[PDB]
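PROTOCOL LOG
Step 1. Enter all chains and additional molecules of the complex.
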Amino acid sequence: RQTGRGEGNFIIASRNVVNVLASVDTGISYAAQGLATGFSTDTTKSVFAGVL
Amino acid sequence: LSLFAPWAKMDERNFKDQEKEDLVSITAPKLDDGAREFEVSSNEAASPYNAAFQTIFGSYEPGMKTTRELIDTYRNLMNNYEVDNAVSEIVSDAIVYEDDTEVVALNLDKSKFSPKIKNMMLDEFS
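Step 2. Run joint prediction.
Step 3. Record the structure below.
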C-alpha cells in the first residue's frame, strides 16, 4: 500500500524468528510443527535461510 | 559483469544439466584436474562478494604468489642456453610447416549427420 511498487518480498530477522519459521509448515494446512527444517539457521554457513 | 553474460548463460545451462542428472552419492569430488576448491551454500551471484573474495584471495596470496615464482622460473629456464634448444626442437616437432602443405587439420573420418556439416566444420576450423 505504501510504496505502490509491490508487496514485501523478504524478511530480515532474529534467529528465534527464523527458527520458528523453519519449524512450521508455512503452506496452508490444518496446523503443524516439528524440527526446524524449512530454512537454514546456521549463520556460520549463510545468512540466507531460504524462502517462505 | 554484463560483458560475459552470454557465457554465463552457457555455464548456467551446463550447471543445470549437472543438477538435472542424479550425479549424487559421491564422496571425493568428481574432479580430475584444474580448479582450486571452495564450498558455500547458494550465494548472491551479483558480484564476487566476501565468499569469493576469500576464495580468490586464498587462491592469490598463498597461491598465485608462488605460482608466479614457478612460472618465472620456467621462463628463466626457457631463456637459458641449450635447454632452450630442447624446447625449440620439441616445439618444432609438434608444430611444423611445409611448402604448399597443410597445417593442423581437422580429420572428418567418422560418421556424421551430413557431408554439408563436415564442410561447415572444416570452414569453422579454418
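Step 4. Note key features.
The interface with chain B takes residues 40, 45-46, 48 of chain A (CB under 8 Å).
The two ends of chain A are 21 Å apart (CA to CA).
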